[PDB]
Amino acid sequence: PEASFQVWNKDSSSKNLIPRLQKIWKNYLSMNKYKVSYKGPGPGIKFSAEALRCHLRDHVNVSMVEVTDFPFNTSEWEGYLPKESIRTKAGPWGRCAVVSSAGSLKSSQLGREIDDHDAVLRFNGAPTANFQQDVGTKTTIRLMNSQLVTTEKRFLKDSLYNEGILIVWDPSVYHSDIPKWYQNPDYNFFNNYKTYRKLHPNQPFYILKPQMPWELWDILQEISPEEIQPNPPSSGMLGIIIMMTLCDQVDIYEFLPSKRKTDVCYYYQKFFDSACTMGAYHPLLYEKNLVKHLNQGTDEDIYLLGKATLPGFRTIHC
């Protein structure tokens, strides 16, 4: 007979959520922090995985702030941004993994498998020490939010960040261009970005353009059958899109949860929070519908391995 088990439900909505997280979702809708007014095609639209993958390649500009973008062409910013394009510095690569920071990675024994990709993406302060056998040992790209660069004093100190290519991103006002964003960043990380840059001139450190997270959000809101949190996508979703721009194959682990689904928010932290898996601030719930929708793997691969497989943009149709 055929096995019965549960993997992520592609049509997850707020009505599936715990009432606790339902109120939180509702409240973020209300305090429209980023002054979002969705004016696109309208809540709820169906795409084939082939078409949506191609609607994603075409309508999201994965690009980094360059020294041509005002005011990063001014004297104070001289020599601060990387000379070369990230695409020059990064691959293009063949096998790539995205390591989510979920607690569900604990005792998953993915460490060797994750190490067998040409390049590995991790987030924020997710550490390697003590976790090699569950998480891997290699860090090629690390995507971080601006809050960590602004406020985490460990960012300028801990030897871990000093591995691979770094990227910082910052939530802007909805549809804001670079100069408006620069004047009003969510966190003021510019000082610390500069200060790091002085410390490690050799290691490539990029700033994501503020437009990218909202371009991805538009598609989310357009897909979902209801209003999603008007806050940018999680680092995890942006990281998926990024690696898709740089890889043929992206294997993404414990984003879609395995059977090890747990309230433990992070593998390196000890505190419990269901919201880390299901979403509170980020529209994480709808991102996972998406990743589950584009998933080219089996449902068994999700149950056992927490593994989704999405193909990279380089290998797509029309």
Ligand X SMILES: Nc1ccn([C@@H]2O[C@H](CO)[C@@H](O)[C@H]2O)c(=O)n1
Ligand Y SMILES: *[C@@H]1O[C@H](CO)[C@@H](O[C@@H]2O[C@H](CO)[C@@H](O[C@@H]3O[C@H](CO[C@H]4O[C@H](CO)[C@@H](O)[C@H](O)[C@@H]4O[C@@H]4O[C@H](CO)[C@@H](O[C@@H]5O[C@H](CO)[C@H](O)[C@H](O)[C@H]5O)[C@H](O)[C@H]4NC(C)=O)[C@@H](O)[C@H](O[C@H]4O[C@H](CO)[C@@H](O)[C@H](O)[C@@H]4O[C@@H]4O[C@H](CO)[C@@H](O[C@@H]5O[C@H](CO)[C@H](O)[C@H](O)[C@H]5O)[C@H](O)[C@H]4NC(C)=O)[C@@H]3O)[C@H](O)[C@H]2NC(C)=O)[C@H](O)[C@H]1NC(C)=O
Of 20, 26, 35, 59, the one binding ligand Y (CB under 6 A) is: 59
User: By C-beta, is 23 or 59 nearer to ligand Y?
Assistant: 59
Q: For residue 132, what are its two tokens?
A: 């090699």
Query: 59 is in the binding site of which of ligand Y, ligand X, none (Cβ under 5 to 8 A by kind)?
Result: ligand Y
Answer with the entry of ligand X, ligand Y, none that 214 interacts with (C-beta below 5 to 8 A by kind): none
- As measured in angstroms, the least distance from the Cβ of 275 to ligand X is 9
Say which entry of ligand X, ligand Y, none residue 103 contacts (CB below 5 to 8 A, set by partner kind): ligand X
Window 194-253: residues binding ligand Y (CB under 6 A) = 215
Q: Tell me the per-residue interface mask from 116 to 135 with ligand X, x by CB under 6 A, - otherwise.
A: -------xx-----------
Q: How far is the CB of 284 from ligand X (least distance, A)?
A: 6
Asked if 103 interacts with ligand X (CB under 6 A), we say: yes
- The CA distance from 220 to 258, in Å, is 23
Nearest residue to ligand Y, using CB? 61
Asked if residue 273 binds ligand Y (CB under 6 A), the reply is: no
How near is the Cβ of 100 to ligand X at its closest, in Å?
A: 4
Minimum CB distance to ligand Y smaller for 215 or for 227: 215
- Of the candidates 167, 184, 187, 176, the one whose C-alpha atom is nearest the C-alpha of residue 215 is 176
Site for ligand X in 15-74 (CB under 6 A): none
Least gap, CB of 215 to ligand Y (angstroms): 5
String marking each residue 276-295 x if it binds ligand X according to CB under 6 A: xx------------------
Rounded to a whole number of angstroms, the minimum distance from the CB of residue 87 to ligand Y is: 14
Residues contacting ligand Y: total by CB under 6 A:
3
What does 235 bind: ligand X, ligand Y, none (CB cut-off 5 to 8 Å by kind)? ligand X
Three-state secondary structure of the chain: CCCCCCCCCCCCCHHHCCHHHHHHHHHHHHCCCCCCCCCCCCCCCCCCHHHHHHHHHHHCCCCECCCCCCCCCCHHHCCCCCCCCHHHHCCCEEEEEEECCEHHHCCCCCHHHHCCCCEEEEECCCCCCCCHHHHCCCCCEEEEEHHHHHHCHHHHCCHHHHCCEEEEECCCCCCCCHHHHHHCCCCCCHHHHHHHHHHCCCCCEEEECCHHHHHHHHHHHHHCCCCCCCCCCCHHHHHHHHHHHHEEEEEEECCCCCCCCCCECECCCCCECCHHHHCCCCCHHHHHHHHHHHCCCCHHHHHHHCEEEEECHHHCCC
- Residue list for the binding site for substrate: 101, 124, 145, 234-236, 265-266, 277, 281-282, 288
Q: Which is nearer to ligand Y, 99 or 216 (CB)?
A: 216
State the Cα–Cα distance between residues 286 and 309, nearest whole angstrom: 17
- Give least dist CB 125 to ligand Y, A: 31
**300-313 CB burial, b ≥16 within 10 A, e <16:** ebbbebbbbbbbbb
| Residues engaged in binding ligand X (CB under 6 A) | 100-103, 123-124, 234-236, 255, 265-266, 276-277
Residues in contact with ligand Y by CB under 6 A are 59, 61, 215
